[PDB]
Design a binder for this molecule. Structure first.
Ligand SMILES: CN(C)C(=O)[C@H]([NH3+])Cc1ccc(F)cc1
Ligand SMILES: [Ca+2]
Ligand code: NA
Ligand SMILES: [Zn+2]
Length: 368
């Protein structure tokens, strides 16, 4: 049936600024929100403003030293922290900006608040588009991510769920999440991603986990230009098998939109419908589901993607004609919700997709 959806958003999020030229634009979350408000989707779901997660909350995963650094560092005291900045991988990809810590607190607060909601059985789905920062590590920033909201949310779910399944359709590998849970069977991580001279450089299919977590990390490496049909060929089958073999009681789905056609940093060729089919698939298992954001650098298409995927969560059909909104000019020249793929070559042959799939299936036969 139709699911109750709780959605997390702080309108201050759009005002954080990574700096001139930096492709990460928090503003995209405000565009997303404004677009789905203008489609009327607030009528169908509960909207919450998340708390700011505390340093205490964050050190459920991150080191005390790293979190102490994140809450002290500012543009005005950077010169005095040059050593700490290098150690914690801050100051370049992951710059120091005004309100950095508060940005992390809001990002993280959405993900944990959604997980609490799900644990209390007061929603079927929770949505935090400001979350999904899958590259942050225990004691270091990486790939524009500082605090790993996903890891903290899963730790919250593990309080009431013996097995949690994490699925990642961001074009990048979910390295920080895989790393955190690599040696436990209580979290299975499934990542689909570009692989081959590409950030972060991990997610080989031969990376399957270790110790009690061996066979609970699943990696589908892809080449440039995958399209809706190649992706669709393998996502439903892999997820069905994972569900069947792993039998999770809760699911976290990272929905990074840098896997869309025309993403400024991405090299895939998915449409918003192709992307969103993944949400559709996971929804059908009828499990407590936390949906998070992620990467995405062509921001009009990020707003489309996460608006449509909100509508998917709600089983609420919306028209292709975009309603008027505060960012209307960004959606030219067509002013429609859905996007076309490019004519870029798909380097992923059908044979390649089926072969990688069959290798993952052999691995999944190793579960209890
Ligand atoms: C470019 N790059 C590393 C990426 O896009 C990754 N997906 C990491 C990431 C960035 C922003 C975000 F909001 C969530 C995750
Ligand atoms: Ca991924
Ligand atoms: Na694991
Ligand atoms: Zn990404």
């Amino acid at each position: 049936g139709k699911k109750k959806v709780c959605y997390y958003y702080d309108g201050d999020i759009g005002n954080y600024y990574y700096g001139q030229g930096h492709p990460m634009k928090p503003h995209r979350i405000r565009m997303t929100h404004n677009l789905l408000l203008n489609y009327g989707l607030y009528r169908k779901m509960e909207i919450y403003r998340p708390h700011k997660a505390t340093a205490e909350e964050m050190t459920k995963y991150h080191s005390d030293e790293y979190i102490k650094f994140l809450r002290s560092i500012r543009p005005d005291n950077m010169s005095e922290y040059s050593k700490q900045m290098q150690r914690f991988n801050v100051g370049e990809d992951c710059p120091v900006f005004d309100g950095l810590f508060e940005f992390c607190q809001l990002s993280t607060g959405g993900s944990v608040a959604g997980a609490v909601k799900l644990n209390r059985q007061q929603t079927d789905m929770a949505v935090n588009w400001a979350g999904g920062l899958h590259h942050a590590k225990k004691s270091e920033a990486s790939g524009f991510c500082y605090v790993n909201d996903i890891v903290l949310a899963i730790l919250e779910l593990l309080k009431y769920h013996q097995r949690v399944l994490y699925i990642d359709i961001d074009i990048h590998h979910g390295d920080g999440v895989e790393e955190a849970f690599y040696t436990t069977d209580r979290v299975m991580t499934v990542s689909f991603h570009k692989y081959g001279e590409y950030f972060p450089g991990t997610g080989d299919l031969r990376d399957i986990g270790a110790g009690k977590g061996k066979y609970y990390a699943v990696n589908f490496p892809m080449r440039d230009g995958i399209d809706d049909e190649s992706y669709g060929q393998i996502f439903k089958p892999i997820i069905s098998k994972v569900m069947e073999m792993y039998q999770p009681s809760a699911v976290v789905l990272q929905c990074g939109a840098d896997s869309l056609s025309g993403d400024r940093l991405g090299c895939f060729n998915l449409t918003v419908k192709g992307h969103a089919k993944c949400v559709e698939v996971v929804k059908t298992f009828n499990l407590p589901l936390l949906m998070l954001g992620g990467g995405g650098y062509t921001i009009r298409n990020v707003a489309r993607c996460w608006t449509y995927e909100t509508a998917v969560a709600l089983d609420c059909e919306i028209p292709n004609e975009l309603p008027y909104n505060d960012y209307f000019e960004y959606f030219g020249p067509d002013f429609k919700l859905h996007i076309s793929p490019s004519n870029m070559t798909n380097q992923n042959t059908p044979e390649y997709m089926e072969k990688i799939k069959q290798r993952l299936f052999e691995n999944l036969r190793m579960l209890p």
